[PDB]
Amino acid sequence: VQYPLTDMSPILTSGDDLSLNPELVQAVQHVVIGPSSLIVHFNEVIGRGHFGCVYHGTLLDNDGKKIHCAVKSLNRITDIGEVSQFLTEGIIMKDFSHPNVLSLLGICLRSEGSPLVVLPYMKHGDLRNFIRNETHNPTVKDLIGFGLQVAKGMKYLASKKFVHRDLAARNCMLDEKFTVKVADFGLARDMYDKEYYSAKLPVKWMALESLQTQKFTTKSDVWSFGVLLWELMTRGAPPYPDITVYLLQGRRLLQPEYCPDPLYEVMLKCWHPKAEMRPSFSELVSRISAIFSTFIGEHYVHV
Ligand SMILES: COc1cc2nccc(Oc3ccc(NC(=S)NC(=O)Cc4ccccc4)cc3)c2cc1OC
Numbered sequence: 568v569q570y571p572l573t574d575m576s577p578i579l580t581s582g583d584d585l586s587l588n589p590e591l592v593q594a595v596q597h598v599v600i601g602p603s604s605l606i607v608h609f610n611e612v613i614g615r616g617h618f619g620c621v622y623h624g625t626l627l628d629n630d631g632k633k634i635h636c637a638v639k640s641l642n643r644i645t646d647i648g649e650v651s652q653f654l655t656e657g658i659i660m661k662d663f664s665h666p667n668v669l670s671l672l673g674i675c676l677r678s679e680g681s682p683l684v685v686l687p688y689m690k691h692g693d694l695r696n697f698i699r700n701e702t703h704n705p706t707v708k709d710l711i712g713f714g715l716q717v718a719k720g721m722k723y724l725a726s727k728k729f730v731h732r733d734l735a736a737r738n739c740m741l742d743e744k745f746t747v748k749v750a751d752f753g754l755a756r757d758m759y760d761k762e763y764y765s766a767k768l769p770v771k772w773m774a775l776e777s778l779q780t781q782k783f784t785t786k787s788d789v790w791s792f793g794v795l796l797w798e799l800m801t802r803g804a805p806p807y808p809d810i811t812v813y814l815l816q817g818r819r820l821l822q823p824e825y826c827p828d829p830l831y832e833v834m835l836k837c838w839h840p841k842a843e844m845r846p847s848f849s850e851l852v853s854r855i856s857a858i859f860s861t862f863i864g865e866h867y868v869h870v
């Protein structure tokens with residue numbers, strides 16, 4: 568409710584930066600973008616969600632060159648926990664340095680309104696929408712290639728002991744050189760993804776054990792990766808067109824028609840009932856790199 572008739576809920580106010588966590592603030596301060604150095608084009612919305620939004624922005628570097636960016640914004644800055652989670656969603660990238668992981672250009676704090684997390688524009692948007700878009704004509708090799716890229720990102724993130732928790736094609740970005748940036752929209756979650764979040768959790772991407780404990784690990788990320796592979800080879804079909812009960816009947820996602828057998832064997836390993844028996848992202852990189860190398864771009868996958 569944006570325009571309530573009356574306040575009913577008690578008002579917990581966070582002021583009249585200092586109210587935030589010191590370490591978070593320090594981290595945000597050293598990736599600061601000056602309010603005047605960023606132009607946000609609020610008329611040019613890239614994507615809307617119920618908690619946040621993403622706009623086209625332009626950033627001027629010190630040399631005067633215009634940089635095209637995406638500017639993520641919080642719809643409401645009255646809840647301190649939401650504001651903190653929002654800045655954390657941006658600042659976590661400051662400690663990642665990998666070509667298959669989304670980077671942070673900076674965070675613009677202005678005198679009024681939402682902080683603004685600035686990201687490099689990703690020409691082709693989210694991987695799911697890209698592969699679903701009929702206009703594109705990816706081959707099996709292209710599609711496996713994207714999976715390989717996601718695997719490399721996750722290998723790096725796993726090496727840094729980072730648990731993704733929401734690995735899915737919708738959360739991977741694709742830049743102009745068709746480089747896949749593992750990511751997470753977080754509070755800018757698109758309003759049309761709500762069906763995939765059932766806490767609101769992404770149940771169709773979640774490991775058997777996470778569905779029951781709601782605990783997430785790198786091994787549960789491996790499960791999600793398998794589903795992500797499935798998404799790729801079906802060119803973005805929704806998985807499993809209660810999921811715990813379904814799975815526990817003894818089922819897995821069916822092999823997609825354009826999914827090669829060795830790659831399905833890999834998805835099945837990613838869905839091993841026992842988490843500890845699931846492949847590492849390192850092994851997935853190895854395995855998928857091999858499978859990838861066998862193709863030559865002659866199998867075109869239909870939407
Ligand atoms: C061309 O279209 C788009 C183009 C778009 N280019 C750019 C950005 C976009 O949105 C994002 C995407 C992602 C984030 N991510 C943030 S703030 N944090 C994280 O992703 C943290 C993180 C990092 C690695 C692993 C897990 C978690 C913000 C905004 C874009 C969205 C677009 O359309 C929906």
Ligand SMILES: [Cl-]
Pocket residue numbers: 706707708709862863864865866867
């Ligand atoms: Cl191919």
